[model samples]
Each structure stands twice: as C-alpha cells, then as structure tokens.
Target: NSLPIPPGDFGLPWLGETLNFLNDGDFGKKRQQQFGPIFKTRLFGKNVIFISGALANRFLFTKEQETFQATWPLSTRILLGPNALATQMGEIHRSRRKILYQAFLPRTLDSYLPKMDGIVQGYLEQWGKANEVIWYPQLRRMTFDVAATLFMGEKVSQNPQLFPWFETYIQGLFSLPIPLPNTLFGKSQRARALLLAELEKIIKARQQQPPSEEDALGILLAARDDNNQPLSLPELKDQILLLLFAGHETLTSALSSFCLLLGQHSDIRERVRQEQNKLQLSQELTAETLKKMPYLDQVLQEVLRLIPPVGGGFRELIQDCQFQGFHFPKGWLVSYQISQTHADPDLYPDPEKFDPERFTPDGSATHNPPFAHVPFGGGLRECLGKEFARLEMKLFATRLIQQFDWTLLPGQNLELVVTPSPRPKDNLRVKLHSL
Candidate 1:
C-alpha cells in the first residue's frame, strides 16, 4: 500500500519520533532527503506522511471536494469549537470562504486604502516619539490596533488583554494529550475561555448595533450562502477568534522578521527607502499609487518567503487516493512544507540567499512551478487574508522605510523559535531614529 509505505522509522515507544520532530527544525527536510519527498514517520502514535516541495503542495492543496480534509486534536476542537474553519469540512466552509473572499477582492480592498494609510502613519510616528523599544511587542501592538480598527470595526479601546494567551494556545497545538490542569493543554483551555469572553463582548455589541460595510465584520454580516442565511452568532464568534489569533499572530511575527532583516542589511533597506522616495505620496497613499510600487511588493514577498510563520499546512485524506502510483490510505496526517519549498535549491539557486530581484514581473516566479513560491499556501484553502495582509504590510512598509532607520541593538540574540509562528527570543530589540 502507498508504494510499500515511505521509508523512515517511528522512534521510541509511545513518544515515537515526536521529540525529534519537536527538537529538529530540519526534521521534514532531512527525512525527505533520506526517503524521497513523501516519507512515513510517527507523530503522537499515528503514522504521519511528511512531504515537502511544490508538487507536494499541489497534491494536498488542489484536491477538490471531500477527497481531502483537515483535522485537529480533540482538545483544540473542544476549545476553539467545532465550528472553527480549520475544524470545518466540505460545503459549508466552501460556501463561507466564498462569501468571506469577496470582501478581500481587489475592488472592495481598493476602497479601504485611505484609512489604512492613516493608521500606518500614526503607528510609525509612535516609533520615533517613543524613541526606543523592543520591536516585536511594538509590532504586535500596531497590528492589534490595526486589526481592531479594521476587523469588524472594533474600537482600539477594545484590545488584546493577554497577547500571551495566543502563545499558551500555541503550546497546546500538538502537545502531549495530558489533560491535567497544570499541563500546557489546561493552560490553553483557560486562555481560550478568557479570549472567548472578550469575543462575547465584541459580538454582543455588534448584535446590538447594525453592521457597516467598511469593516471585515460588516462584510461577514452581509455575507450569505446560496440559501441566503448568514453565519450564526457562534459561527461568527468562532471565525473572529480564529482570525484574531491567526491573522494577528502571523502578521505580528512576520513584520518583526522584516525589521530584523532590514536592520541587519542596511544597504537593502536604503534601496527600499529610495524606492519609496520615488513615490512622493503627499496626502494619503491611495490604491493606484500603492499598486505602482513593485519593489515593496518584492521585498514583502521575500519576507513572506523566508519567514513563513505557519510552516506548512496539515491535511487529512477523507478517501483513499492514488498519487505517484500509490494507494495512500485515508486519515493519515499529511504535513507539507512552505519554507522548505521556498528554500529548495532547485527552486532558488543558493537557497539561503536574500535577493528580492528575482520576483520582478518577468522574473523567476513566473518561470517556476506552481506553488514553488507559495507563501500563502495555494488553491481553494489558501489564506483568506493574503491580499488583506499584503496591502496592510505595503501601506505600513512604504511609510516605515521612509521615516525610520532601525538598527539591531547589540547583544540581542536574533534566533527563531517556531511556536506556531517563528518569533525572535529577544523580541527583535532595536532603537529607531528619524530618517
């Protein structure tokens, strides 16, 4: 079955290869080299199929209908709820995604640029006024404020009381199934309750007040399926909670990563500034002007390419299927790699190298295989907010490079730890001065 199963060992007793998988960042990469692209390994006592590369992405991501679905652990499902989009399968998610996707369409998002311009400018101004601080926390704060304002029209007054709550949740992502209250699992449950309470307040307010088309929540409110029914309150809250943690946390880690890279490589940073200098946006950056800056686009893509926070997505087959002339059994965990695909030597010569020029209109991305540069995964289940996140970063990046030149503070260990998202240990320490 499945070409005599991919070659690899499931180490240890009940733990198996879980600890190695935990400790090793290159776990998937090493296995792929050892046993070809798709390999059999054990994680949490079940056989796992760890696959990497652009083709692997195409395989899992492009499957239509119930051919494949995603699964999460019991604890996570209970905590995040059964209605969580990642917990959802088939038609409802497809219908919901179709509705949600509309608000992010090019036309709808174009109407939103001016407000984005204002918030981005204000937050960037705070950098100089505050003089110096750890970059990641500040980055999180700006994004929280941004998300609050734009998502569901939440007032900045409503906020992230425990930014740490998400970290607690991440720790429980695939941790030991121990249900002890003192365990990571227990803490994540508590954090979920705390987060759910906050969401209740926000949700109740929205229920009391009519929705507006200007914000994401408003869009969700207006969205209806073929049956013309909107998402129930629980459905809406679950979706928001998922977006709050996923969207905020990923963008938070990534923008900080961009700062660390830009700070270290001053020359590239200067060129970025020079690129923005050419665009003398006096009032506010409109959609027309924002779309014109290709350099910023390349740099953002490069940032996304290198520091993909959500490593790869996980998939589960609903029905047994054949691929590469193998009968892959149903319900086996399928993990695909994003950063590895990005770093593949065949895809990008000198894989670890940092050069954004390859993404010009006529450049490597066009010539490359599909999903080779998939920073936002690919196909039907691709990130709903990829466009939203891109424009949001672009709005910030243009003003940011023009105004502030940030340098990494000495002795700050800029190492990465992948707890859900890859974040720096010393919080990307930096002192910003005026340009």
Candidate 2:
C-alpha cells in the first residue's frame, strides 16, 4: 500500500529547485549522483520526481503508460499553444497520433526524397559560391526551408517570414505563465495566432484538392481516423505546426552537432568522406544502407545522446504508482532529465570524451541499455519522424563530407545556448572548401 519515494529536498515553497537548476551546468548529473537513480524536487509549484536507468525508463514509458501521462509545462504551452495536439492526453492523443502516423509512413518519406535532395543541392550550390560560411544559422535556415516546402508544400523563399514567427514563438517557451503586454509570452502568443491563421488558410486550400500530390500536407489532408473522420481545421493546423517544429528543430540540431564534431575530429571526418564517396554512385540511400554506415551513425547517435534536442520533458502521474519500492502520488510531475542518463560515466566510460566508436558494434553502445541512448523518447509516444530524421542526418552528413572539407575557425568557441533547442553559443563559425 506504501511506496518508498526517492530522497531529496524539494527546496523553498515557490522557488523550489529553480535557481539551483538554472545555475548549474551539470545539475542533472550531480543530482542523480547524489540522490541515487530516482529523486524528488519541486519547481513552479509542482512536485517532481526524476527517474533514470534502463528499467526505470522502460517502466515509465511502457509498463506504467496508464499511470503516467505526458504533461507539457507552461513553457511548452506557450510555444505550442493550448490547442496543439502534443498537449492533448489519452484518447485524443491516440487519435491524433494515428492520423499523423499515416502521413509520415516510410512509403511517404520515400516519396519526398527527391524533393529533399533538390533542396539540399540548392543550398549546397549557394554555399559553394560563398566558399565559407557560419554553419549553425545557415543550416537552421536550410532545414526550415526543407520543412516548410516538404511538410507544408510552401515555396522556398517563404521561410523568411515563417522563421520570424518560429523565433518569436520559441522565445516565449521559457517565459512566465502570465502574458503581460509586450512580454515574451505575449509576443509568442501573437506569433502563434499568426502561425495558426496561416496554417488554417493552407489547410482550407488543400481540402479542395486530392491527396495524390504526395507531400506531407497532401497526405495529412487525406488521412482519417478509425471512424474515417478527417482532421478538423484546428486539428490540422495544430498537427502541422507540431510536425514542422519537430521536423525542423531536431534535424537542424543533430546536423549542427554533427558538423561541429566533424570539424574537431579529422580522422573520423576522412572516414566519413570515404564512405560517402563509396555511396556516390548509388541510385538511392535507403534506410537499410544508412543503418549500415556504422561510424557515421555512431557519431550522430553520440551527438544526440550528448545534446538532446528537447533536453527534458515532464510526465504527470494519472494514478498513484509504486516503482522499485518508491511511491509516486497522483498528479505529481516526473521530469525525465536526459542529460543525466546521457552523461553517466558508469554507463558510458569517459562519457565526455567524444568517442563515436562507443555506438559501433565493437563498442556496444546499444547493448548498455535501451533508455540510455534515447535521443528520441521511447515507447508508444516515440517520435513519429524517427526514421525520417535518421535518413536526413545520414544523407546530409554523407553528402557534406564527400563534397566539402571544413575547418573550425580559429578562436571559435562551441559553447551551447540551452534555449530554443540547444544551439552553438556563437552560431558555430567554420570555413569550408569544396573537395
């Protein structure tokens, strides 16, 4: 009847652990090391428990699905808005996931490859002309273009306006709950309204057409639930926005991390170059072949493991549950601190040592534990675009390594700014030359 909750101070009533968390670079790791695998804390008036280890991860994601539900914080609410599908729970969430699954199926992504290739080639051409450029911002722009065009079927040049809206909205993600006039949350709210308006207009236009066009928007326009019900206008807009945010942000982050890693490691970079050269004559880069590129995949995996796109997320307990003799009360928030699990030297010896071989067959990274390498969350709510994201990373990395050589600019610092997704603190300056 009773469960043994992990030990830790929840801290001052309202302030909780907020100040300590914000000030510490390795707060999650330090907390886990001190408090054992599971610990309790409080923030923003919510009682929170942090859990790690393979068994704990599996329990939270799979075994305790009914007891633990995804709970978006005030930050996610501000950025995604209240009506977004990601904020929905239970039946509604399942329905929305089903509808989205149809549009992102393997067959559909395969169809979009030609368009993705063209977009990447277009950027490569422009970058070649400049010969050298700052990569992070430029790659963000390119990924945004790819997402807007492939996912929403928009023209390439439309991203300038779209990107501003994304920027303003993401800025509000960390603001206080109340939306004061001219405040970050207020601006983000306005930007979300504008984004929804644009999305609705697109959805309305697409409704009058057939789904045979093969773009993400087209597929979504035709997808139906178990009852064969099409997505409502609002639902369509929210789902589209969710996909756009997920597709562009995470892919861009992974690519940026990859570029930074390669810039620092020339030996691995040369091997990647050799691998890409071998693939240059292939008709297509399928998921099977991409998986076979162990080194490249390992590097990408290591980067994701080190710096997750959305570093953390919250889940609320729907019912009181006991795990490993610990009792979690109903409505308590459990924060899955990704960086904690990722940086554990016990699981990853010399965790900070930039070693891609850790994920290779010889290194046995995957053999460690399922949840230890969760760049994308696991279980029923695992990312819908997982396969697509991998394909994009592999294709982009292979092509870039083969076609160009890059060096980190002298005095460049790759410090991470932890907001709006982890990005280079200095925008990641680098110099590139065509191979």
Candidate 3:
C-alpha cells in the first residue's frame, strides 16, 4: 500500500488549490492542459482525481454503486442530513431512490402541469405589469413556486419569506466552513433550521391525514422495503428537505439559461415562439409526449449542451482501488466535468457557438460517445428530477413565448460565473411586455 499517488499538484495542506478553484473560471482547462486526463489534485482536504471526457465519465458513472460511489462537498454532505440520498450509497441509495422517482413519473408529471400553468400565468401577469425586470432572479422566483408545489405539495404561502431565505441558505452552501456568528455559513445554518421547522409543520399536518395519499410526501411515507419497513420520521424529513432543495437548485439555472439562449438567438427563438404559439395553454399532454419536438427539443438540447446547469459530478471509491498505476484508497474523490466533454472540438465542431442544428435527429448521431453530453448527468443516479425539470422548462418556455415578449436590455454588464451553477454576474436584465 506504499504506492505513489497520481501526477499533478496537491497544493498547500488544508488549502489545496481551493483558491484557484474558487477564483479562476478556467481552472479545469488549465489543469487539464498541464496534466493529462486522470491527474490528481487536492480539494477540500481530499486527494482528488479530475478526469474529463466520455470515457472518463463512463469510468466513474458505470460502477457508481459497485466499485466507486458518489461523494459531494462537505457542506452538501453534512447539511443534506444523514437521511438524504446524497449521503447514501449502494443498496441504501437504491431503497430510498424509488420514493424520489414517483413524483417524476409520466402520470405524476402530467398531473403537475396544470399546477404549473396556474403559477406561470400569475407570474406572466405580474411580469407583464412591470416595465423592466432582472431575468435571472425573476426566473428563480418562478421556479421556486414550481418546486414548492410539485415537490412539496404546498402552495407558495402569502408570507413567502421562505423563498428569500432559500437565497441566504444557498449562498452558504459554498461559503467558508468556519461558522462564526456573522459568517455566511452561520446565516445559512439559521436559514436551514427555519426551513426544516416550516417543513416539520407541513409534515405534521400531512400526517394527520389518511396514510393512503398520493403527493410526494404521501408516496415517500408509503415507501416500504421488501420486508415492509417504512422510512422513519427523521429519514423522511431529511430526504424531503433535500429533495425540496434539489427541486429548485437546478431548475432555476436550467430555466434561466434556456431563456438567455432564446434571447440571444433570435432566428431560432423567433422560430420557436411561433411554434410555442400553437402549444395551447388549455391543452395538456402526457409526460412522454412533446419531449422531442423537433425545433424546441433541438433548441433546449443545445442550451443544455453549451450551458448545462451543472458543470460536473463526483465519485468516490467505496473501497481501495487502482487505475493507471495510481492507488485509490477508500474515500478518494473523482470528478468529471460536463464543460470538458461538452467543449471538445472533435465532439462539437466550433463548440462555443450556439447551434441547435447540432442536436437534430439523424444528423445528431452521437458524433461523440453517449456520456459526452451529460446535462443531467447519466447512469442510475442521474438527476432524479430530470424529466420533471425538462417538462417545467418546455412548458414555461412555451407559455412565456406565446404570452409575452422580452428584450435583453443593452449594456447591462451581463457575464456568467462558474459557481455551483453558471449564474449571471449581473443577474441578466431584460425588458418585459405582454404580446
């Protein structure tokens, strides 16, 4: 077991390229160039392997539960709670996984549409009244409502301070570990407690009802193992809260990116808004239907390709393992970046340019490997809410295009930063008006 680790810098102890990771947008690109694929670095005090491309991704994702397992940053791992799926692996992950997917199924997702329609209509009306709005935050607020109802089965209450507190909570997700009184971590901790307390009331009220219920909480409560063991109250709360956070986390970025794409590409956007015209708000479709609509699918697929809500995912060795003469002891961290594979010139000719045509059916044959384009990640633990997020995007895009017009206000100093998600530096200003 006295083998040398992988090539590349481990950096300062307890620091370990952490600053380069936070401050530099092209940190991955620089590292990949300096060291070959599968090089090592130190992050968050762990020996980390940063690998990119489809093959490397498959290497991690394929055996996720068996040889390699999933691991996230400390804040997410610790705060998502012991019962969260993000904290579980192997059969423990599989047991709790089913309950999470019920809300994303075809019939279940279809049922959530009218609920989204109601929320979207109100949002559009509110936006229509405003002369100008910041597109990014507006999209965030809208998706929060969508996440609340679909995931929590709770209405966006009148005192919607919870919505804003989520902002404070999220800032802390990536903040410094030291949790002093005035620290971002401290505020985030407080926000989390409040959210859980609010969730407790929601769960307690739901418990008073018959066990035979069907919403997310009900389905989660009804979950039983082969021996008929149900998730404990603590387990239920932890998972529920995590899913609630997971619900909005990606959709906000996904929806905002999609909107920005449409705004930037007028030829495609104009073409699709016409297509959106035909999509009647009154008409409802099954979840499986409308997924691959020629133009919209291509457009949205391209958006996900260029600006995926998540840049990468991580895997950890469940036990000792070795690859390419490198020893991976238990808990060694491995990661693959979507930006890496998605930007490969061989895979995507002129990769930075927007071209929805790149995703066209026959023309879109995987010029690259299957895992090359992982907007939602891939494999067994691929985003649990992938379909849920997709449907919400399609419906929201359709509704907005048909009902309103938006123009990106000029000189707004908009730029994207790589955080937990790619978010706009300026929050993306836009002028909004009803059509």
Candidate 4:
C-alpha cells in the first residue's frame, strides 16, 4: 500500500520538469486545475508538492509549522550566502527577527519620513522632466536610489559610479545556477562579491562612530537583543542585505504594477487621484490614510494578487504529513501557489476582471477566509516588511498620480515577465504629462 502523491508529471529522467514548469504561462494555476490543489512534480532534482486554497495555505505556514520549513535550494545560498538571515531557521531565525522589529518601529520609521519624502520628490521632478520614459526601469532606479540613501545612508544616486554596480548586482539575481563564464550567474557572483566588499566598508565606517539616527543601518547598529547582545559583523551584513533586497524588490514591483494598472483604467485612476488630493491637504500618506482609501487599497491588493512579486515560495517538509487525503513524504519540498488561490473563481468571482470593488468594505472579496489573500504570505515566516512595503507603495502611487498624469504608449502590450520580480516585458513604455 503506497501513499498517494498528488497528480503531476514526474518529468523525463534527467531533465525533470524544469523546462515545462518554467515555460508555462501560468504554471501555478495550471498545476492547481490539473491536480486539484495538491500535486507532485520534480524540480531541481527534488520531488515537490504545490498546495493552494486559503485553508491549505494557512495550514502549511501556521497550523503545521513544525512539519513545514522555509528552505529553498542552493540557488538562494549563492545569492545570499550561507549566513543570510533568510537561510537560518528555528531560534537563530527568531533572534534575528526580534532585532529587525526594532528598526521598523513606528517612531523609528517616522523619523525617516522627511528623508523618504525628499527622495520620492526628487525622482518625481526628474521623471516629470523626462515626461516620457519606460516605467519599470525608472521605478527600479528610483527604488534602488532610495534604498541606498534611506537604508544605507549613502548618496549613491548623486554618485554615478555607484549606479552601475547596483544595477549589475540587481540583474545578477536571476542568473542561472551553474556559474559558467560570461553567464548571468557568473556576472552576478562577481557583482555580489563587489557589493559585499562595499557593505563591509560601510559597516566598518559606521562602527567607528555610529550616527544617532541617520538610516536603517544606523538604527540596527543601535539595536540589541533581549539579552542585550549586539549583532555581530556577519549578522549585521546579512541584516543589511535583507533590508536592501526586501526593501526595493517587492515595492518596485508593486509600484510598477500600480502605474500600469492605473494607466489602463482611467476611471479608477481619477478616483485614486481624488483620494490623494483629499489626503494631501490634511496629512502625509500613512498606514491609516491607506486604510481609509478602500478602493485604492483594493486596487493594490488586486495588483499584488494578479502579479505577486514572489509568485510562489518553496518550503521543505521535515516530517510526513497528510493533506486532502494525500500523503506527503518526508524530505519533499512543498510550495504555496499564491496566484492560483488569487485566481480561484470560487474565491474571486469573475477572476479575470480587474475589480478593486471586490475588496471594498461591503464586497464579496472580503467574504473569503483569512489566508485567501496571501500577497504578503502568512504565519511567523510571513514577510516582515509588509507594513513598509504597503507604505512605500501607497506613498509612491499617491504622489505619482497627484503630480503627473500618464498613459500607455500606442501599441504597448504591457506584457509581464515573472522572475526575481514581475516587471513589464517591454519595460512599461508610457507617456506622462503634468496633471
């Protein structure tokens, strides 16, 4: 009597399912429909199961936490190195997360608002001057510049020499596993080495005489564990890398998606514009203001759902478990197909329709179970940067809509490329004019 593995192709011998899985337009949704939410496939030499639906999503991340673990293959190690916080598990992971919370405190983040506002406004001025530019690239540059300034306390934007290195490092993220010469991965490896060296230099400078409240690094330097233990040099390096990656990657995707969506839907754009105008008069954009703008929030929710930066995340099974009557074996990898859950017709009626109204106060979208919307993931391992990501997205969207009007250029397809993060395949060509 053998245990049941979810329905999916095990793949041809050596090749496995790598090519087919990667080639599918919407692989997650396709897998869910064929396998009924839980299915097994071979990827990167591992037999993996993909689970969908809100209940299943919750169970994996929360209820059965001991059974499931967040560990991707060696690809992550190449980029983050062995010591990155994301790679750590159990108590070590907990310690790092606790220290991280201090840096994201409301009072701490508030102190940086003036600086963030200045950065956003500076980019707006330049983008307005250009009047017409591909948005994904522009947003990427803007977010990276902000990250360097706000998180690392570096004026990299003003220094053209630093821009190329940053750009190369970001591009290296999606490189191939085998670091062959002249390949993307090879270049990315070199870039990582360069970035790490640069980070070391900055860390040493801060240690010599730490600033009182200049940026995220400074705040972390000033943070302590419950035991009053300060972060080690290696620990500090991992934390800074996490902030830099998490800070820019997802928010850039959200902003780019927001701009493209708003460009397509003029009515929704106008509604958001009105909301921004009203909010601007009384206060700067904040979490509370974003909450009040239900429609705007819903629009962002839908965008993230439709094009989540991390399409699905990989987890490894530490113990055998049963789901939907199928037995999951130990040492197998599991994934949560977020896009499939988002696209479920039962959960989201007329799933293809871009309707922010679905998530409005009295709407059907709000009727689903808690974990149904997992753009930020769920449970202890859920994204720690959720609040920061939201604030940045809301602020960027509000200011952009209020300051400049934009429309897609003629014949632009707005095709999305999903890897590292979702960005326009054509870089989101758009024409902009002052509102």
Question: What's the C-alpha lDDT at position 312 in model 1?
Answer: 76
Off by over 4 Å in 3: 1-5, 211-214, 277-292, 319-330, 364-367
Please say which candidate is ahead in lDDT: 3 or 4: 3
What is the per-residue lDDT of model 1 for residues 164-255, given as tens digits with 9 covering 90 to 100? Answer: 67567757765666777898878888878787777777777776776677767777767787888878878887777776666677788778
Cα misplacement distance, residue 78 of candidate 2 (Å) = 4.6
lDDT of 4 by residue, 212-289 (tens): 656778877887767888777777776787688878777788888888888888898898878766665333555455
Please say which candidate is ahead in lDDT: 1 or 2: 2
lDDT of 4 at 254: 84
Tens-place lDDT per residue, model 2, 1-435, is 855777888899977886565445566667777887888988666888988666667777876567778876665665675556678777777887777777677778776677777788778778877845888989988888888888888553374678888777767766555577577778888888888888887777777766554666777677777788877777777777888888888888888888888888888899877776665435465545655686787788887887777677688888888788888888998877666667778778887777888877867575787787777777766777887787788778876776778888887668876665777877888777887
Summed backbone clashes in each candidate are 1, 2, 0, 0
lDDT of 4 at 23: 54
Task: Give each model's whole-structure lDDT.
Answer: 0.74, 0.76, 0.76, 0.75
Model 3 TM-score (2 dp): 0.92
Worst 10 residues of 1 by lDDT: 153-162
Candidate 1 matches the true fold with a TM-score of 0.91
